[PDB]
Symmetry: C3
Subunit: 336 residues, 3 copies
């Protein structure tokens, strides 16, 4: 690419949507390389994360935890306008694991309250990748305050199985998983603070135990359950992108599988197949492809079941369609 | 579904881990209905030499529950019994199964009930099963109410390149994280009912730090009378599961020649593994040919977990020492 | 196979170098199998592990933590002279994960202070592998006192990708990662002890929490930073061997990737590609191959970021060469 060629490329503005939903995109790329433009506004705000009204001073790309999923194709350029409003109190930046150089972009995007920056990078490697804020000297605090998200760099040809056959999903969800480290007082009750900075020393004491107090999808216990369950129909092909910026996880679809799982997140490494539970190390995204076969409620968990059912790491899928008694049947229903 | 009753049926006799019931690696015929029965026992098990107890919630009376073996596309039909002398509702989630929370949504049985579930084993590999009563899921799992099944390919095991892999022995290591409450003196507490230990146990669990990490339900379980045996030249498959917590198996003195670390037989295996990794909520399988005789240890390779918390087993291998592979050129002696 | 055949093979004595450097070696085997001779003296020694001057009685192969990387080729023999000086206080041995029998050699190498031993084993399996001391009854305590290292058994034809094309590195680093469990007093300050034995009971308590006090590269917090930073240039192909004898890790090059990663560390298992963060279980070594594309400072971390930036698991690369604006550019600098 010449200087002539790079400036000549199409620009395309893309509006983000909140997770677990993903902005519209084409799986197979349309036309040649382009510069895909995205804007995100940073919000520091108090969120409630559990049923006892536990508060976090969230630090949120686009106001959500996780940050939204950005979608591009291989050798496109991602050009992000990152804005830190005058209402915030901390400097922030962004590290895309999908980018090369300057600490993922962190070294170039350090913006105080009241400033903006525009970073462009070439998306040379196909896959799902974490991005997170990373101010020097304070990185784990920003990240565990929920300032992280993911992107997906689709291959220009869309996705393929290990023998090169097309894998085309009908829909795509993004589950961002968050470990929170909320300080308690002597009596075991979670503390509240006036400004984010007040909580700093207390939170580090918690971080250093390496034991989160909460492990949550979409920013809170139960954000993806009940009426906010994810949805599919028997016969639909669903891609579930899962990210964890700081800590290991082990996703599992209770009553399903991952028919094809890029556990490492990278689309040039052939997927694993038929998975019960896959493993995503902290600081990575992964993706699982699954065709639903049975209707009903499913759970989708971090299969450390303490983390899933005590600490908040559980979602639902609501699936419509016809039951298949060949796959499974109750021969004799509970009886005595 | 109508034609399942036309298929051959087979009642299996289960055996206690680490042994695996009789079966053929290559499928003997077209799809069958393979039938199993398991009675759930709520019981006290002693987990270390200090007499620490757990309120075990045990499939077939053992932690882990026994290993069921079927072939891809057979139906596994389980009769699961919750005796009237038990206190809790229980059920079964097979990770191998498709629909209704792996069967959990169809098998909730109160003390004094049975149920029979059937599922088509459509995917080849080793899979976790475990109890999953809504509202108290990890309590049941970390009380030892979990096991595994193996769904062999119809044509048996192969490597990545299509070469048949055929074992002489198979063992099943179920690894258990336990969360035993302690008193003010750091003494493990004892209780008289599963229910009475609940909240104390929940508090230990939320620390995410097991007080014990054991094979076959106890420190030293898989040693001495339950040491696993082989001879130089024999090909052994070591099925390993952990229903709730990561492990990193390692055979001390050997390797995993072929490891399906994810547990799934259509994923080509890793080769020449020193230490492999099985995530909480999965099973994996490691294939090795013994080359050297002696006692081997087999460990979770967080060695604090192996050697302080209980996660070590032994293999006992007969045969001829091979000096090409390894020899002591100078025995330990003065400088 | 036979004693005669073994005796007839050429001998080669090799001098070890201190990590993170690796002794001279050739990627493609020069000639046929030989018996490669190494000598390591065990030193029980005081080491400092942070800027606060926290002190550990290390049990160091060759006097370094990790012990040095030994490099052989597949079906060479490795013949280690192990020496335990009369001045030491404990029995030690060596378990090579690369070796077959008698617990990796631990069974044959138990040496009291004032004794030495010579173990020979045949290097049958290509990959990087942990070695560590393992005295029956005090195995973990030796290992998390720093008594561990790695070896690389290269294929005779050198490294290849999954599809049989040669991968030749320009340089190699060995990053040994250590978890330490350092006892604290009633007011949370780290303790000192007069002999290794004095630290025993207190350390065991910290160990059983499974929460390390420090997580470090090359023996100490910041050991691979400043003027000890690893270095490279744009265009340069770097292999990074990373080991962890006791505890998982999830290595990440900040601003970079793992182009080819043998996450399991074994060269007959095809590498993952395009990795953002890879995973190395406790008890293993792994290797990542990367071509630097951009100049500047990188950090190379365990991507549990609390472990990286609170507990010490972060190293730097200094990289010289020309900035590539096509790969990344700051379209708009922080402003407003
Ligand atoms: Cl489940
Ligand atoms: Cl070992
Ligand atoms: Cl990072
Ligand atoms: Cu920030
Ligand atoms: Cu990062
Ligand atoms: Cu139960
Ligand atoms: Cu499960
Ligand atoms: Cu030692
Ligand atoms: Cu070891």
């Amino acid at each position: 690419a010449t200087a002539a060629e790079i400036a000549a490329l199409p620009r395309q503005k893309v509006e983000l949507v909140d997770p677990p939903f993903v902005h519209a995109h084409s799986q197979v790329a349309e036309g040649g390389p382009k510069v895909v433009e995205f804007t995100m506004v940073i919000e520091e705000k108090k969120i409630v994360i559990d049923d006892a009204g536990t508060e976090v001073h969230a630090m949120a790309f686009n106001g959500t935890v996780p940050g939204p999923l950005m979608v591009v194709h291989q050798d496109d350029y991602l050009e992000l306008t990152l804005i830190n409003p005058e209402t915030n109190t901390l400097m922030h930046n962004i590290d895309f694991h999908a980018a090369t150089g300057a600490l993922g972009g962190g070294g170039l995007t350090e913006i105080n309250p009241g400033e903006k920056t525009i970073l462009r990078f070439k998306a040379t490697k196909p896959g799902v990748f974490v991005y997170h804020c990373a101010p020097p000297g304070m990185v784990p605090w920003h990240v565990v305050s929920g300032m992280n998200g993911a992107i997906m760099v689709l291959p220009r040809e869309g996705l393929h199985d290990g023998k090169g056959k097309a894998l085309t999903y009908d829909k795509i969800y993004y589950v961002g998983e968050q470990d929170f480290y909320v300080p308690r007082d002597e009596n075991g009750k979670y503390k509240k603070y006036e400004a984010p900075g007040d909580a700093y020393e207390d939170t580090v004491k918690v971080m250093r135990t390496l034991t989160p107090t909460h492990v949550v999808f979409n920013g809170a216990v139960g954000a993806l359950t009940g009426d906010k369950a994810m949805t599919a129909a028997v016969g639909e092909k669903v891609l579930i992108v899962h990210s964890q910026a700081n800590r290991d996880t082990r996703p599992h679809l209770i009553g399903g599988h991952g028919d094809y799982v890029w556990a490492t997140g990278k689309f040039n490494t052939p997927p694993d197949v038929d998975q019960e539970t896959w493993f995503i190390p902290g600081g990575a995204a992964g993706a699982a492809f699954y065709t639903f076969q049975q209707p009903g409620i499913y759970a989708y968990v971090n299969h450390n079941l303490i983390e899933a059912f005590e600490l908040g790491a559980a979602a639902h899928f609501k699936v419509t369609g016809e039951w298949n008694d060949d796959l499974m049947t109750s021969v004799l229903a509970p009886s005595g």
